[PDB]
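Sequence only, no structure available. Ideas?
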Amino acid sequence: PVECFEPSMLKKKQLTVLDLHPGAGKTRRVLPEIVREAIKTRLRTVILAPTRVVAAEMEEALRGLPVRYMTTAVNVTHSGTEIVDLMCHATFTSRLLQPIRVPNYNLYIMDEAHFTDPSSIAARGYISTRVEMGEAAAIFMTATPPGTRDAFPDSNSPIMDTEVEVPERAWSSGFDWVTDHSGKTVWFVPSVRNGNEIAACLTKAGKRVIQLSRKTFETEFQKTKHQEWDFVVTTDISEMGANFKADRVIDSRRCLKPVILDGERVILAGPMPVTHASAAQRRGRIGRNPNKPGDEYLYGGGCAETDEDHAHWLEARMLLDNIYLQDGLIASLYRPEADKVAAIEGEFKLRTEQRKTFVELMKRGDLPVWLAYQVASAGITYTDRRWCFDGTTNNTIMEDSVPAEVWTRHGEKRVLKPRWMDARVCSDHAALKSFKEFAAGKR
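Reply:
I predicted one. Tokens follow.
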């Protein structure tokens, strides 16, 4: 595997995967070395961060170098002469779908290039296709390169890996090893609700617990830096952009993931096995300090053998089939990922007007890719929300165990019952609030 950057990697037609184990200095050391060389050789460059949190960490590593930050996660003074841009994976792919002039970047740098968000998968397909066509160079950085299946990468200090029965519910006995520990534990859970139950159990046992989710990360993660705690109970939000001074990770190795059932609806299936890349990220929270040997990773089962049931792979093809490349050429998925989907290239290419609807439903509408595709390919216009109310009864959306209701643009209170059901529009309070506002015609 390639673990060291060399300037020769910046030549066109080169796609290099830098296999950088957790704690090896991917962002603090390697990324600045790449960016410095790119600037010196006058290469127009885009740096692709998986999240806003990671984008902000990159600015710290790149501080003082001329980078244009195309994210509101960073506020610095641009000189206007920067040739290096920085944006999130989703921003990049979203811009590819717009009628804009996507610059001809000579170099693409993708951090956390294992990320399986549809926009990340699609970005890797676009980038790798451009490299194969001879138009650019790319560097993909990750602890787990796409196509590899090692959940136990290297670390700065040896990690003790033990498979155990991991509790996934509150317990009154049977798991003394959880609470007998005198150190600090990061515990990964599949959902906020599940974490609430485990955190409540630990708190009743006298432990100090901080809970992390996407909603609460900004305020609560700071508390892990400045307050005493025994346990961090966190969703997958902490697989990237989050480090802890801990000596143990507990990982049930399960997650929820969207799955398309019978091509007809999307459910949040699981909890079911996490991917090797995710398990490696979770484990990678510990074993980071050479002077603190003895860290422990306690895990509850195996990783996903196939992630092909994950809806994100098909969604990535829906995005890529609708990104213009050259004379109606369609990019392929990155080769080590290409067999995760069984659709023919072009199956999801929409004609001009339906494609514009698709794009607007994802951007302004903030709908999942799969759902936006169903609506746009049905010939529905962006502002016509009648489909949110005319599904079959089994598509009724519930709020607190009663049918959810919305005041529509036409002044009628109607039960939310979309023609196509995607569990991601109502999987938590924030999602449901957002979909209600969409159904009411408020955006």
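The first strand starts at residue 15 and ends at 19.
Hope that gets you unstuck.
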